[PDB]
Amino acid sequence: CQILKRIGHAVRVGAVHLQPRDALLFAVDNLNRVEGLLPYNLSLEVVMAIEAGLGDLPLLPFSSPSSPWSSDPFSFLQSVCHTVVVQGVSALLAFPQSQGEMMELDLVSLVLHIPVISIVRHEFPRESQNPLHLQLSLENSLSSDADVTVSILTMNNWYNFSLLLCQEDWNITDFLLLTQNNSKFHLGSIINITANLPSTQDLLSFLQIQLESIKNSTPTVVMFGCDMESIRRIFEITTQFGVMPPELRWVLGDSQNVEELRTEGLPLGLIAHGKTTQSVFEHYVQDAMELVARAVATATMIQPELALIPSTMNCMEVETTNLTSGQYLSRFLANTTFRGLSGSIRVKGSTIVSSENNFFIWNLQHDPMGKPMWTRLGSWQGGKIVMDY
Amino acid sequence: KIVNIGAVLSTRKHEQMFREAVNQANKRHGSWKIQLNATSVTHKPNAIQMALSVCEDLISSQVYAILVSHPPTPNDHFTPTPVSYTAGFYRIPVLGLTTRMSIYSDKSIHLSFLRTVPPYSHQSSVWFEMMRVYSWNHIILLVSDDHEGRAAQKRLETLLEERESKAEKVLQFDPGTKNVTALLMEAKELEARVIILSASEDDAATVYRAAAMLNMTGSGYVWLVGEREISGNALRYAPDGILGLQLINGKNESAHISDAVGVVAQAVHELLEKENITDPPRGCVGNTNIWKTGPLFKRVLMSSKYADGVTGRVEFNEDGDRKFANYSIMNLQNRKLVQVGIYNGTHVIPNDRKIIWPGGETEKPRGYQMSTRLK
C-alpha cells in the first residue's frame, strides 16, 4: 500500500538514445495489456531521457540542427542521473550505435546504481565484468542457424553428407565446426558453384558431374550460402538429368525466408530451415521490456520496498550500500529468461542477453491438392529440435 | 611513432624505478624510430573510482601494455582485477608481476593477460617429483574450499595420475575454518602420515593448533604446506621441521618491472616490422571497435626467450603460466626458517644440511602403518 502509493503503483522504464520511441511505446503497451506480467497491479510506463531540458511535452514537430555532443561526459552523466532520480526509472534502456556509447552507458549505469540494457545491432567484445550493465544483440550468431542444419545431421541419421556452396566466400566454418562435433556424421566432397563461368553448358556439365560423384558417396546434401535463384537453378539442373529425391537429400544450410521460399521450382522432399519471424528492433524492444517487467515483479515479490524506490536518491552523493536496488534488480535480470517475441531470451555469463531464435524446419512435400508445398517438419529452440508431428 | 608503457604502481619509488627503466630501455635498444614514454598510475583506494582513472589515463594515452602491482594489503585481489578488467578484451594484454592467484589462469575473463610468476598450483607440478624423490608411496591431501585450492588439488591429481595414484584421501576443507580437529579425526584413521595442504594462513592456523594437541606432529608424521601459509599468522604453532616451500625472488618488484620492460622493448621491435601494424586504440570512449591487431600481438609477445633479467630463462607460453622458477625450501627450526633446499625448477638440488622430520625425528619417515586391527 505505502510502496504503491509512493511509486504511483506503476513501474517506469528509462529510454536514452545517444543519437526507438515507437518500439518502446509498443513494448510498453504489450507489457501493460497483458495481465500477470507484474504484481500488485503494476502498470508499465516509459520515460525518455533526451538531451533536451526539462519542460512540458509539446506536440509540435521541431526541426533544428542539433549540435554535436560535448566532449565532457560529467554533464551528460549528471543529467542522466537527475532524470533517473526524478522519473524513478527502474531500468534505463540504451540504444548505443558504437562501443564508446555502450561504455558510456555502462559507466552511467554504474554511477547511478541502476541496471541498463543497451540494444546493439551486433555483439562487441566486452571487457568490463560489471553485472549492472547488459547488452542485447539484435542479430544472433550465425552458427546457431548452422546449428539448425547440424540438427538435421543429428536427427536424420545421414552420416554421409555433402556441402554445396554457391559462393567461394561462404562462412562454412560454423557448419564445419557443428558437423565435426559428432563423430557419427561424416563429410563428403565439397561442391563449389563458381559464378565466373561464362557458358551455362559448362556449369550444367559440372553440376551433373558433381551429382554423379555424390550419388554414390553421400545421400544428403546441404546448400550453404545459396541464393533462391541459385538453388532453384541447381535443382532444375539436377532434375534435368533425373537427379531427384529420394536419391539425394536436399537441405538449406543457410537462412531461408518463408515468404521467398516459393513452392514451385523446388524438388520434392527438399528440406529448408528459416527463422520463425523477422526479428525487427521492435520485437527485441518488446522482449527486453517484458524481461524488465518480469524482473521488477520478481524483485517486488520479495522486496517490494526496495524494488519500488531506487536506492540512488542523490546524483552526486553515493552511499556505501552492500545491496542496492540496482543490484537487486540486476540479480533478478540475470536470473530472468523467457520466450519473447523475437525468440527465447536468456542470460549468458551474467552479462550477455542472448536471444536464441526458434528455427522452423520444413519439408517440401505433397499438399492436399497434390502440388508441392512447405510442410513444417518441426521447430528447434536452443539447439534442441522437436518435430511438429 | 610514440610507444608508451603505462603502469599502475604504488608509492613514488616504483614509479621512479619504472621511469628510469623505460628511459634506459631506449638507450639499450637500437631502435631509433620508436620512443619510450613513462606513465605512472597511483593505486586508487576505490574499486569503482579505478575504472574512470584507468580509462581517462591509460586508455586515453593509447599506451602499450599495462603493468599491475601487488596490492598494498597482505591479501587482496583488487589492484590487478581493475587492471585486467579495464583493458582485458581490448587487445591490450596486461602484465602482472606478482599475479600468483591460481583462479585467473583459465582465460574465462580478461583473456589478454599474462602471469610473470608461477602460481601456487604450479609448484604442485614440481611437488610430485619432490614426492616421487622422497619415496612417499601413500600420502594424504587436504584441500580447502577455495578456487586456488581447488586448482592446486586438480593439478596435484593430474600429476599423481601419471603413476596411477589416487593420493589415498583428499579432505575437502573450507576457507575460514577455525576448528577442523573433528574433520582431522578421520585423518588419524589413514595409515599414511603425510599431510599435503595448500590454504591461506587463516585455515592453516586452526589445523596447526589442533594437530599439536592431537599429537599429529610427532615422529613419522610429515606435514607439507605451500608458500601462502609458510609465512604469516599460521607459523605461530607450526611444528619444527615442517617441509614447506618458498619461491626465490618473491619480492623483487623492481626486477620484475625491469624484466617486463626488457621483454616489451624486443616485443615492440618485433611487432613494428609486419603489415597491418595498427596503432593502439585512442581514448577511453573514442574507440568504437575492437583493435585490428588482435591475436597476432599476443602471439608475438608470448614467444620471447632469452637470458634477460635477474630471473632469466623467460619462456612464457601456453595460457600464460610461468615455468622454470627457482624454489627455496626452508625448514622451521625453533620457529626459524633456514633455506636448506634449492630447486632449479627442474630437479631438487638440496644442500648438504640435514633435514629433520616433524616432532624431533632425524630419520626419514615412513608413511606406512601395518599391523592394523583386522576384523
mmCIF file of C-alpha atoms in Angstrom, chain A residues 98-101 103-104 125-129, chain B residues 85-90 285 287-290:
data_model
loop_
_atom_site.group_PDB
_atom_site.id
_atom_site.type_symbol
_atom_site.label_atom_id
_atom_site.label_comp_id
_atom_site.label_asym_id
_atom_site.label_seq_id
_atom_site.Cartn_x
_atom_site.Cartn_y
_atom_site.Cartn_z
ATOM 1 C CA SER A 98 29.124 2.400 -31.021
ATOM 2 C CA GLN A 99 31.286 0.672 -28.432
ATOM 3 C CA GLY A 100 32.167 4.023 -26.864
ATOM 4 C CA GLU A 101 28.481 4.828 -26.408
ATOM 5 C CA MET A 103 30.862 2.025 -22.442
ATOM 6 C CA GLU A 104 29.436 5.442 -21.546
ATOM 7 C CA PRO A 125 33.996 -7.508 -27.373
ATOM 8 C CA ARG A 126 33.062 -6.565 -23.802
ATOM 9 C CA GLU A 127 35.897 -6.471 -21.262
ATOM 10 C CA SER A 128 34.027 -4.986 -18.292
ATOM 11 C CA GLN A 129 32.669 -7.568 -15.844
ATOM 12 C CA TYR B 85 39.089 -5.669 -16.366
ATOM 13 C CA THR B 86 39.657 -2.175 -17.793
ATOM 14 C CA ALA B 87 41.867 -3.370 -20.680
ATOM 15 C CA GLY B 88 41.097 -7.080 -20.823
ATOM 16 C CA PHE B 89 39.449 -7.766 -24.185
ATOM 17 C CA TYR B 90 40.649 -4.577 -25.930
ATOM 18 C CA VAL B 285 35.350 6.062 -25.293
ATOM 19 C CA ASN B 287 37.363 3.726 -29.730
ATOM 20 C CA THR B 288 34.194 2.148 -31.124
ATOM 21 C CA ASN B 289 35.514 -1.250 -32.268
ATOM 22 C CA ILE B 290 37.999 -3.954 -31.338
#
